[PDB]
Amino acid sequence: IKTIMVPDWDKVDPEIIELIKSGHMRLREGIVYWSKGKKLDAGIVKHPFKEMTVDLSGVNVVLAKASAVKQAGLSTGIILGAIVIQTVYLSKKLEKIQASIDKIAVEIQTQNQLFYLEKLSSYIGSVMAAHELLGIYQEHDPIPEIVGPLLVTLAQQRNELCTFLMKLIGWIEQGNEHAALIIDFITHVLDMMPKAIYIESTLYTRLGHYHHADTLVETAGAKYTAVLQAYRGWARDSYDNLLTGSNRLLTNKFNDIKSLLNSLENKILLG
Amino acid sequence: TIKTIMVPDWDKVDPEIIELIKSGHMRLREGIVYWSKGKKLIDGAGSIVKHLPFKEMTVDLSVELSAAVKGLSTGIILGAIVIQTYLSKKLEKIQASIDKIAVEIQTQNQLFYLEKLSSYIGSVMAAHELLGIYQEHDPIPEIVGPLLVTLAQQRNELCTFLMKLIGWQEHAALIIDFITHVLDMMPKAIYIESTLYTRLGHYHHADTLVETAGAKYTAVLQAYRGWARDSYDNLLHNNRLLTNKFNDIKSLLNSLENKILLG
Amino acid sequence: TIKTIMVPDWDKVDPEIIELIKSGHMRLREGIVYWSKGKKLIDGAGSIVKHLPFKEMTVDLSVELSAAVKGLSTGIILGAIVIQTYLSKKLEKIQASIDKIAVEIQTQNQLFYLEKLSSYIGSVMAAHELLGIYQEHDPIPEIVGPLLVTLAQQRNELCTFLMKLIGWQEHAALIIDFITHVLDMMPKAIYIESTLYTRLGHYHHADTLVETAGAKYTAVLQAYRGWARDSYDNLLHNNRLLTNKFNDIKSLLNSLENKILLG
Numbered sequence: 001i002k003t004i005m006v007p008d009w010d011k012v013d014p015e016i017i018e019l020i021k022s023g024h025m026r027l028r029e030g031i032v033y034w035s036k037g038k039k040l041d042a043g044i045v046k047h048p049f050k051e052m053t054v055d056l057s058g059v060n061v062v063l064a065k066a067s068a069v070k071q072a073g074l075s076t077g078i079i080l081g082a083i084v085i086q087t088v089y090l091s092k093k094l095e096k097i098q099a100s101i102d103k104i105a106v107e108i109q110t111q112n113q114l115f116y117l118e119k120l121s122s123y124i125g126s127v128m129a130a131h132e133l134l135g136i137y138q139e140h141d142p143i144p145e146i147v148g149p150l151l152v153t154l155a156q157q158r159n160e161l162c163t164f165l166m167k168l169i170g171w172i173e174q175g176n177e178h179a180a181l182i183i184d185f186i187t188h189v190l191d192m193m194p195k196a197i198y199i200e201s202t203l204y205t206r207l208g209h210y211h212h213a214d215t216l217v218e219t220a221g222a223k224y225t226a227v228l229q230a231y232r233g234w235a236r237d238s239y240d241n242l243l244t245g246s247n248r249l250l251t252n253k254f255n256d257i258k259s260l261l262n263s264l265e266n267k268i269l270l271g
Numbered sequence: 272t273i274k275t276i277m278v279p280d281w282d283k284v285d286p287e288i289i290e291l292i293k294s295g296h297m298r299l300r301e302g303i304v305y306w307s308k309g310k311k312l313i314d315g316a317g318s319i320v321k322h323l324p325f326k327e328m329t330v331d332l333s334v335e336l337s338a339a340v341k342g343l344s345t346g347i348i349l350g351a352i353v354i355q356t357y358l359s360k361k362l363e364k365i366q367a368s369i370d371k372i373a374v375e376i377q378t379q380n381q382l383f384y385l386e387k388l389s390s391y392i393g394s395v396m397a398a399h400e401l402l403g404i405y406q407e408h409d410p411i412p413e414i415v416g417p418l419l420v421t422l423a424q425q426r427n428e429l430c431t432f433l434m435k436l437i438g439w440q441e442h443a444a445l446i447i448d449f450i451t452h453v454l455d456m457m458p459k460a461i462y463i464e465s466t467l468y469t470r471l472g473h474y475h476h477a478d479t480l481v482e483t484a485g486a487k488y489t490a491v492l493q494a495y496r497g498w499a500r501d502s503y504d505n506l507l508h509n510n511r512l513l514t515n516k517f518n519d520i521k522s523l524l525n526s527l528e529n530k531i532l533l534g
Numbered sequence: 535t536i537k538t539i540m541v542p543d544w545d546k547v548d549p550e551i552i553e554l555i556k557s558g559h560m561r562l563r564e565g566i567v568y569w570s571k572g573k574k575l576i577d578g579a580g581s582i583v584k585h586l587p588f589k590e591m592t593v594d595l596s597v598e599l600s601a602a603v604k605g606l607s608t609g610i611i612l613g614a615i616v617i618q619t620y621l622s623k624k625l626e627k628i629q630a631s632i633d634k635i636a637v638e639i640q641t642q643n644q645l646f647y648l649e650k651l652s653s654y655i656g657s658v659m660a661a662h663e664l665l666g667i668y669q670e671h672d673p674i675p676e677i678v679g680p681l682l683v684t685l686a687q688q689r690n691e692l693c694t695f696l697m698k699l700i701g702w703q704e705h706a707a708l709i710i711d712f713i714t715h716v717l718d719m720m721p722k723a724i725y726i727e728s729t730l731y732t733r734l735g736h737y738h739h740a741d742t743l744v745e746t747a748g749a750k751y752t753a754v755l756q757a758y759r760g761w762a763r764d765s766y767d768n769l770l771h772n773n774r775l776l777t778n779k780f781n782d783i784k785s786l787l788n789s790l791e792n793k794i795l796l797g
């Protein structure tokens with residue numbers, strides 16, 4: 001049971017709504033702006049919010065489609081993004097990932113851990129700090145000298161994680177149920193990443209760089225999708241060898257892989 | 272042992288400013304008076320109201336308990352001591368205990384949390400250095416900004432590390448002393464973080480960050496309390512040592528110093 | 535005959551602003567509240583404090599004497615009437631009397647003073663126009679500045695002209711009526727000049743200019759008084775006309791309206 005802030009369209013000028021419908025204006029996190037090449041002489045259009053209640057109980061967060069009285073994917077993505085940015089929904093998943101790290105660190109070979117769990121923990125810390133910074137917010141006082149370096153670190157760590165994440169499947173043959181642990185960990189990290197991308201886009205929007213935010217979502221989502229496709233290929237080539245001569249738990253984890261590949265939540269978050 | 276700090280000299284402050292502070296229209300942090308959120312009466316863009324005049328004050332560092340005899344002034348002097356002197360000794364002692372703790376948590380294979388903690392020390396120290404330079408010189412946002420990002424990141428990861436420590440004889444005494452002192456350090460570092468925000472002219476950011484970071488610190492503190500309440504009897508020579516450690520825990524749980532620092 | 539003016543709506547003003555006005559820290563002119571000279575309490579560069587909220591008020595123009603029943607408010611409403619309505623009629627009547635006065639002063643061979651007076655009318659009118667445009671729109675310094683120079687120049691030369699007129703039957707009645715009405719016009723034009731200064735953000739300039747220009751006006755007025763005291767008996771059908779003219783002189787000499795307009 002949480003209370004978020006959603007755009008109050010009854011207080012929005014109808015011409016703004018019509019220009020949004022025609023594709024001349026776009027929206028990200030309660031801020032309207034001109035679409036690329038659609039401005040009608042430099043520069044932001046307009047920022048009104050009202051309360052909405054959502055019950056965060058393993059609840060399907062996409063709780064949004066039900067909330068359905070006016071103009072569908074647009075408002076659905078609006079409420080999804082509000083849930084991601086304002087609630088503790090992502091904090092619980094980050095703490096779960098840290099718990100998985102804690103458990104995996106004692107179930108591997110010390111020479112095979114190397115430095116990857118450290119990088120994952122650092123990235124989780126950066127995402128937590130970014131969500132916290134999103135929590136402190138003064139609309140009439142931007143903080144570019146802080147949001148800038150934060151976006152830097154977030155971009156570096158996300159790009160690096162994209163390059164070394166699938167490598168971690170090797171930990172299946174490097175134990176000290178184990179394969180299920182590793183697969184679950186990788187799936188949850190991948191499921192978290194689009195939320196972090198959406199946080200990066202929100203931070204870009206807070207600085208007034210809306211087109212930057214759109215393009216960043218596109219390119220980061222492209223790299224993330226490439227990693228997902230590598231994950232899919234590995235699952236296709238390892239399903240039989242893992243479920244024969246090595247039962248219910250691993251099958252549930254492979255089903256979780258398939259659900260990650262068809263995540264409507266991550267599709268909405270990534271445009 | 273005798274130190275000299277700068278404190279607001281209210282005899283050089285116009286009484287109308289004092290009054291608007293007492294009416295809640297204005298707030299104060301580390302020598303800066305500013306308008307409260309949504310309480311600005313004049314027409315303008317910023318929120319700064321006044322840079323306070325400073326007088327010298329002698330303190331004896333040999334802390335929450337002599338001055339302020341003429342809640343607000345207590346917090347002012349406490350923050351002045353935290354900023355201008357006290358935390359460096361705590362950080363030195365924390366750094367000194369890192370190796371023996373590494374020995375005791377080696378089987379968890381997450382020693383990098385002790386590296387980052389050390390980095391956190393550096394960061395806090397660097398921050399404490401900047402404020403010193405900023406006692407007579409202008410704050411530089413290209414320097415304060417990245418340091419604030421690093422401080423936030425490392426503070427969040429340190430909270431996760433303390434949670435993992437709680438989740439994991441004399442081994443217990445060593446780890447309990449470590450956890451207690453690291454937790455005790457955190458509110459001062461939060462205060463330093465917020466003072467950097469203030470030096471950048473973001474006073475509302477500073478107040479709200481104290482709120483949020485203190486809530487996270489309080490969540491960790493309550494986890495520590497829950498652990499200490501369910502483990503005191505199953506752990507009792509060394510009995511007196513563990514009893515002193517649990518008394519230190521209870522002192523941290525009711526720390527007036529940290530409650531003042533966290534608002 | 536019924537006119538509507540904008541007056542400060544004090545029910546929409548924070549009481550602390552009102553209080554700082556009453557303590558002398560802040561002053562007011564035509565909808566603008568600003569810090570008094572050397573009384574600014576906050577840290578800043580400008581002197582602006584507040585743009586007052588405005589309410590509608592009906593007056594009947596058919597003036598210093600109904601409203602303000604809830605010295606300061608009297609001056610506020612008087613200035614609002616001078617700015618937003620009243621002076622135009624006075625200027626029209628002055629312009630209408632210029633030709634007959636030219637006939638009566640032709641032997642002095644300084645009729646250009648009547649040309650400049652006419653220009654002064656234009657200038658004042660143009661100024662009155664700008665303020666109207668400036669009720670909803672931003673003042674433009676490249677427009678207000680040169681007009682202020684012209685207003686100052688023409689006001690000084692008009693004072694010299696009035697002195698020369700004083701230095702120079704029914705001829706007397708005509709010239710006395712002219713002098714009395716021109717002098718009566720001057721304080722309103724001074725007020726308009728100062729309001730232009732206010733619209734440019736130069737409030738202290740406006741107050742000091744009212745002071746200096748009013749001192750010059752008062753010097754001319756006292757010359758007029760000295761002339762009227764030494765000429766009333768040597769000038770007395772037309773006797774009633776001259777008596778009415780001298781009564782108008784005495785009314786101008788004790789004009790509460792002009793004393794309020796000139797501070």
Ligand SMILES: [Zn+2]
Nearest residue numbers: 115118383386
């Ligand atoms: Zn390392």
